[PDB]
Every structure is written in C-alpha cells, then in structure tokens.
C-alpha cells in the first residue's frame, strides 16, 4: 500500500514486497 518508487527505473508501485524485490533486483545488474 502507499505508491512506492523505483526510481532507478522510474517505475512506481504501491507494492512494499514487490518493491523490496525490485530494489534488489535492481543493484544486482551492475558488474
Ligand atoms: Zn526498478
């Protein structure tokens, strides 16, 4: 609940497990 977002993509969620994923799946692409 509460708009959440990813803003190192700029996609915005109101999903707060979702997002704890997305965050994560995000500083993993890096070498
Ligand atoms: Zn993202």
Redo the contacts with the bound molecule.
Sequence with gaps: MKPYV??????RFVQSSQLAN??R??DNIRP
């Design positions: 990813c803003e190192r993509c700029g996609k997305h965050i799946h995000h």
